[PDB]
Amino acid sequence: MINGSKRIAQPIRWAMVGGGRNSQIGYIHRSAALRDQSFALVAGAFDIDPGRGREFGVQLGVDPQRCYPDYRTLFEQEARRPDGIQAVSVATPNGTHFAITRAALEAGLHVVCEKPLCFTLEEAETLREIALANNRVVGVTYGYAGHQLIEQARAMIADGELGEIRMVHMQFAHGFHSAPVEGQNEATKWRVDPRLAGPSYVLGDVGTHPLYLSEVMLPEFRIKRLMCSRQSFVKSRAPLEDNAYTLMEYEGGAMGLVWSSAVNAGSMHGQKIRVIGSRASLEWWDEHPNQLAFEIQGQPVQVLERGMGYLHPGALLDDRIGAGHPEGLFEAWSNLYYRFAMAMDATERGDGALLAGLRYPDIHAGVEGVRWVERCVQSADRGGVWVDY
Amino acid sequence: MINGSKRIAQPIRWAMVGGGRNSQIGYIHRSAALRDQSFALVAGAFDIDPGRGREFGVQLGVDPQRCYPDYRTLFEQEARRPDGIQAVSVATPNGTHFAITRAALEAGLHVVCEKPLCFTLEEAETLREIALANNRVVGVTYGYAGHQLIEQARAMIADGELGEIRMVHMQFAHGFHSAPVEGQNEATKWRVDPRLAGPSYVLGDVGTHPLYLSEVMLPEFRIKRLMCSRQSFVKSRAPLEDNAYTLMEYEGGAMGLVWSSAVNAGSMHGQKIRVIGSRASLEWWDEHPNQLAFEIQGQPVQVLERGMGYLHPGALLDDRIGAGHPEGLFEAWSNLYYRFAMAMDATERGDGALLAGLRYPDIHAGVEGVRWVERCVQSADRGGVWVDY
Amino acid sequence: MINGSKRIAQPIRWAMVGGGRNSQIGYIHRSAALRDQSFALVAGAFDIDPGRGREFGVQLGVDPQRCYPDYRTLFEQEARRPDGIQAVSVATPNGTHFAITRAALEAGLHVVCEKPLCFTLEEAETLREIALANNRVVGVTYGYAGHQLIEQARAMIADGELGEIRMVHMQFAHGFHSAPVEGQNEATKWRVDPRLAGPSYVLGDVGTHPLYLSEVMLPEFRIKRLMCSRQSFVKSRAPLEDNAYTLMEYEGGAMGLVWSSAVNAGSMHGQKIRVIGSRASLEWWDEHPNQLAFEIQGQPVQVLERGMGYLHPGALLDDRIGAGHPEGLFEAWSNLYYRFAMAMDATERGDGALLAGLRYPDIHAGVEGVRWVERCVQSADRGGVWVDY
Amino acid sequence: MINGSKRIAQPIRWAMVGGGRNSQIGYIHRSAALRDQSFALVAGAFDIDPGRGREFGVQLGVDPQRCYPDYRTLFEQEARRPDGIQAVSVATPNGTHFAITRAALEAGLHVVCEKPLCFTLEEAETLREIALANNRVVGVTYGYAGHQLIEQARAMIADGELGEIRMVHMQFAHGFHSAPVEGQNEATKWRVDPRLAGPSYVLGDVGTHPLYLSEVMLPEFRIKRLMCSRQSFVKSRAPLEDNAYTLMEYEGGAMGLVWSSAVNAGSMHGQKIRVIGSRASLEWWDEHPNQLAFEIQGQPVQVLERGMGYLHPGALLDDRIGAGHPEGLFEAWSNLYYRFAMAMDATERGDGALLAGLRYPDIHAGVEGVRWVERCVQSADRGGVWVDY
Numbered sequence A, B, C, D: 001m002i003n004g005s006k007r008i009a010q011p012i013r014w015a016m017v018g019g020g021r022n023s024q025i026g027y028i029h030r031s032a033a034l035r036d037q038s039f040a041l042v043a044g045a046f047d048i049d050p051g052r053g054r055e056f057g058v059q060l061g062v063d064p065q066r067c068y069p070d071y072r073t074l075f076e077q078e079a080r081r082p083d084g085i086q087a088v089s090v091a092t093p094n095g096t097h098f099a100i101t102r103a104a105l106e107a108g109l110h111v112v113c114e115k116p117l118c119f120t121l122e123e124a125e126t127l128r129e130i131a132l133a134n135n136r137v138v139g140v141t142y143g144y145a146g147h148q149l150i151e152q153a154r155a156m157i158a159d160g161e162l163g164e165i166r167m168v169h170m171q172f173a174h175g176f177h178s179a180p181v182e183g184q185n186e187a188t189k190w191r192v193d194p195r196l197a198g199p200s201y202v203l204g205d206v207g208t209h210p211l212y213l214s215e216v217m218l219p220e221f222r223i224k225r226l227m228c229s230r231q232s233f234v235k236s237r238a239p240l241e242d243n244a245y246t247l248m249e250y251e252g253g254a255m256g257l258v259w260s261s262a263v264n265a266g267s268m269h270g271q272k273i274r275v276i277g278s279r280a281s282l283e284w285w286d287e288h289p290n291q292l293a294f295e296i297q298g299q300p301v302q303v304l305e306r307g308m309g310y311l312h313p314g315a316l317l318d319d320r321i322g323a324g325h326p327e328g329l330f331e332a333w334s335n336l337y338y339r340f341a342m343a344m345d346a347t348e349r350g351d352g353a354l355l356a357g358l359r360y361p362d363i364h365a366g367v368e369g370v371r372w373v374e375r376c377v378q379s380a381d382r383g384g385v386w387v388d389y
């Protein structure tokens, strides 16, 4: 159980780049980071419009003199103060993640970087080498992985409760972009611009979420080959896809399927992962994150509930209220952010034992997300043929 | 509404080949055929064990002298009687469908043939030419197509309620063969024998069901290309697949996906079809056949119910009881079988107007089912590459 | 499993009174009765309009000379023929059930009587004495009790799987009469006329269905006291109720609740029964009759599926197709009607051993349904006070 | 939308009484209060064990010298400091709510009081008079009322979308106390002690939650009469009930039903409210708080989703993330707590216009909760008879 007791001596001194007044994702970063004394928001470069960034920073309780016009000034000016930031969350559009993360790491700061890490695998490999050389934590906000029942699924699979794993069926298929909403909505507009978004739309934007859930649940699984067929149903998005099918062969013969979509008309979110074994399946759906289907062949189907005593102990650690009270995605994000804070603090203290026991989406998860999108785009561009992973 | 009033002057004089005492499917054929004065069971070759076939025929109320040891004797002996059969249902294992259907057609009998029609497209084309030359009806028991809400979905799509069709997502993924049950179960045993079952297991056995539903809903849709990746997770079934992924490109750019499986551990049936348009999606699930999800992007999701006045008139014709009372797969099969009887009777009477207005799974549907399986096996055998359809 | 093999040597020679061309319930009687060689429809008094009754009888394949204008002529004329009826189903409006059932019993016929048996407990007691004196079977069409999982629930309760029973929560709450549809619909019109319907509307029409399910599941349970508060929300129905709450105390301290409604706007049927024990609950919903919720406190909830090997053997006897294929209310009614036929045939043969092992809704169930409605009306009329049962 | 911008100039200086290290509810108070700069936790009397209260306060970041041994010392010592508390949340067991709230109000502090306000209506009336005389805000943590779709339901009802309201069906029926867990669990133990808990267990503990939801949705509705039948199924709890049925007549003829239970074996929470009108019903379930069923008679059922543009504007104000991302009970509590802070700040500033537009569970809601429990206990003690409300 969590009761708000501190996990580190003092909150990590913290800034955001992006996540400004009109952003989609800025708020959940702060909601999760400020919770339970993990981080303190003392500075930021909140907006591309520096005037609006400072107006908003002040409404967030930030010193107007620590609302900087850009990330370079933020890092340089904060470095001069003994109470300067120790960590920065990057919530800008995708095109700036590489440059901002690189600069933060070279400035000796820990980073939480919005997915994706960057556009290309070569950039991802460079970022990872710079993070490791500078001994910095890089969290990546695969936020759904914060839900307790993802750890339950991992533990059940590891204990052989599904038998031998045969298939991993993943989807993130919503309908919000069935129409060309780019015309009116700035957040969608930049996501269908290859200059600002990169080589893919839905593969990178939504496909990588349930992919990361499969990596938490099946940590030893390795993709041998994949093929990807992708479409721009809203023709103006071409070459960026608003729908894709990724079929994968894992080492050992298991199969993987990822359906990525922003044109699944009527779907509110539709992020699901079903892991199918020789004995049993489990299935999780992000819109109802407090339940996990557990279906042993030839037995009654079961539903596992967040907070119940029959769960693996790893799956009960982060309960903030008793079973039957619904937790949501803010709890999942809070569960990642306190781990980010413990990892950053542990790094500063040289607490190697604590570091090694902490599990969170990190630089390595970020690299794999970029690798997968790049291989999918390579297959799709060659007309949906099998490629070596 | 249906109230049991006759649709033809007299029940079609009818026989079964197969569907004996220990069969899985024999009973639903009779339940549907005998309902509402459609067919009268007057003869049969019910079993590979002729003694057990006659024992069972007598318990079905059939004259023991009209319980014949084989289909050839059935057709020859019945031809001698003025009250001889006019039609025969073929519910034998897959390997005998071609020979029995061919003999029945050449004997001037109407046929209801269990899916699949036969193993090869060349056999299917031959059967169809013989059915047409002899002016015989061949029904095919794509039984799920008898559910009223399949016609509702067809009518909604035709009226543009989904907008332009983008994707057709189909699955028939159950878990009953997660373990090697072939060891104890004769019905599964013959299905994993290529000599008796043919070139595929789950593609032919279950994949063709939701494929046929898509052909009812999207009658003008044409597959341009497909690829199929198939697996034998129970290794002893090789080369017959217990799992398969079929990805299809339709003419006009829409995509199709079929997941066929007998190893989806914990799944009771899992036959679903989701049609996704630019405006809205619909989705139907065979285990809850009296509801149809209708999901307009940006509006509340809706559930359409069997028997309600807001349905298209085609979708209300076959209601046997008021909305809210659950109908099941026996009603769906009864809805096909009365149409089979009307078509057979209309053929005898030369009632061309009635024939042209009747919609049922016919010889042409049977040919397409065989074509699709054959193309999938061709792609799968070449390592899951795109093939022209 | 059922495979259509005869259960009695010859079909019971059978008539209907009512169930004519425009009736709601006539068809499901015939669908269930004619199935599997149980009954043969050889005569009827189908309609209050004798011309329309004969037109319809002929379309049902009945000899026009055995389409009689009334039940008295039916019984008198059939008595003269060696192939005369042996049994009659009564599907007339409620007001005529007593007179028609009494006449059939005095004529030495077995009866299947539509619920309710009659208006008053004194009439019910008289009917029962006449049925017993004449050694006749009286089936009552509590059709939902034919669903296999009702027997599963009975068996689980009897084996202590719920622990000590604490509460029985019952509802049959649909919305079809939220508006005054009596204006246009003859079936609703007679149900809100006390002269033709009797002392209650929804208590008798729908409340008695889940009440009977509780009597199957908890056969030793006895109601000690009840109170009933009833409303006419469509004011013109007064004094007949379109909504009611019945609260009951059982002997031993368990509580019962029945919500009866025709004004639950938006509800398609809403017949549910939840039995709550010290250890676990089970819950069944008529619109999804092939599943049974089984919820052990402190364990994952389970869903039990029709046709699965983990069910009690009593619950597998009536399976007509494999698990995962949806059966519906026609199967439930067919399961009662073959038992009615076996009981009638067993009575004629003096097969006391078979009779004693048969379980079906009978004269005694019919009497209890009338008793419960009468006590509820007595409480409601006294302003919803506790009455001795 | 909420983006974390301040709603008042400075966070309310805040304390808790109770909500200590081992409490069930202490954490959600702090999670909601500290969010978005609403309150600052600067002091507390956290625990009956003052040593453990101070240990925990320090882990919450509170000055050890402002971790006081009791509420009287907290109020007296804080009054001496210019940075003293302005408001206090009371999260002690029920028996101390009256004395602590009274003392806080007399000390000129705003209060958030855990439900229930107190044991007796006479105490409730006294507390309310003292709150009003001292011009203090008293929030009451009917936390479920913070869910956006409760406001959607209120707005739909007010706009006549349900037609005339006929029934209000409420339940809070969980199974966690099916067994005598009081033996091992201190939180359950005090709830079944009349000295510490008061005159009821489940009526007060859970029944009052969906009752308050009905008061938000139907603000002009007035209970004319009610009856209550209550049971102690775990006999040792007598006279405190672990199950109850409350039937109510509203002025104007609508009916209300509340099922309160801690012995609904297998239920994870089971808090539901269904409002049934002449035209349509709506239904909300606390375990899936982001959906609202909307069921127009004779139309397809609909599901309304949190965050969608078709919602009433009142129902979109508190969205913290886009539609399809699940919010939970922490958001609901955060939505109450920021309103509590705005009301307290508005009271200090004399901003009468802002005060009058704020809607939150207040002193008046607290009084009604106590009134309802007291009337239910009065009816139950007289053997479940109608009492004037």
Ligand SMILES: NC(=O)c1ccc[n+]([C@@H]2O[C@H](COP(=O)([O-])OP(=O)(O)OC[C@H]3O[C@@H](n4cnc5c(N)ncnc54)[C@H](O)[C@@H]3O)[C@@H](O)[C@H]2O)c1
Residues within 6 Å of the ligand: A017, A018, A019, A020, A021, A022, A023, A024, A025, A026, A045, A046, A047, A048, A049, A070, A071, A091, A092, A093, A094, A096, A114, A115, A116, A141, A142, A143, A186, A187, A190, A205
């Ligand atoms: N579940 C998730 O983890 C999740 C969900 C949504 C968004 N995201 C990711 O978060 C990032 C932002 O997404 P969004 O939807 O919030 O975008 P958005 O367009 O809604 O917000 C962008 C914000 O960054 C600011 N900004 C832009 N350029 C800047 C610069 N150079 N310096 C400082 N501020 C700058 C803008 O003013 C704005 O406040 C993307 O990488 C996106 O993929 C992740």
Ligand SMILES: NC(=O)c1ccc[n+]([C@@H]2O[C@H](COP(=O)([O-])OP(=O)(O)OC[C@H]3O[C@@H](n4cnc5c(N)ncnc54)[C@H](O)[C@@H]3O)[C@@H](O)[C@H]2O)c1
Residues within 6 Å of the ligand: B017, B018, B019, B020, B021, B022, B023, B024, B025, B026, B045, B046, B047, B048, B049, B070, B071, B091, B092, B093, B094, B096, B114, B115, B116, B141, B142, B143, B186, B187, B190, B205
């Ligand atoms: N939904 C559907 O349409 C559906 C479902 C299941 C089965 N089927 C099809 O029905 C056919 C039979 O399937 P099943 O599962 O009932 O098989 P099964 O093995 O359970 O039954 C085979 C039956 O045919 C009899 N038989 C075998 N060879 C015969 C012969 N030469 N002459 C006469 N009788 C013979 C057997 O004795 C037995 O009664 C197959 O083609 C299968 O694919 C269709």
Ligand SMILES: NC(=O)c1ccc[n+]([C@@H]2O[C@H](COP(=O)([O-])OP(=O)(O)OC[C@H]3O[C@@H](n4cnc5c(N)ncnc54)[C@H](O)[C@@H]3O)[C@@H](O)[C@H]2O)c1
Residues within 6 Å of the ligand: C017, C018, C019, C020, C021, C022, C023, C024, C025, C026, C045, C046, C047, C048, C049, C070, C071, C091, C092, C093, C094, C096, C114, C115, C116, C141, C142, C143, C186, C187, C190, C205
């Ligand atoms: N689940 C169930 O068991 C269920 C469901 C619905 C109906 N019912 C019961 O079935 C009975 C009929 O209900 P319904 O909804 O079908 O009614 P309905 O009004 O739809 O049908 C009445 C039928 O009886 C005929 N009829 C009327 N009076 C007659 C007479 N004196 N002699 C011969 N025929 C006569 C009418 O012409 C018509 O065909 C009622 O008792 C009703 O409660 C039971």
Ligand SMILES: NC(=O)c1ccc[n+]([C@@H]2O[C@H](COP(=O)([O-])OP(=O)(O)OC[C@H]3O[C@@H](n4cnc5c(N)ncnc54)[C@H](O)[C@@H]3O)[C@@H](O)[C@H]2O)c1
Residues within 6 Å of the ligand: D017, D018, D019, D020, D021, D022, D023, D024, D025, D026, D045, D046, D047, D048, D049, D070, D071, D091, D092, D093, D094, D096, D114, D115, D116, D141, D142, D143, D186, D187, D190, D205
């Ligand atoms: N949804 C809701 O609003 C909700 C849910 C649960 C609890 N509650 C209410 O919250 C209150 C507490 O419930 P709980 O389940 O957390 O109880 P609990 O027994 O779990 O916690 C009681 C806490 O108060 C402390 N305490 C006890 N007496 C004290 C005193 N005199 N001074 C200071 N601290 C003291 C204890 O040490 C402990 O920390 C009750 O009134 C309960 O009804 C409301």
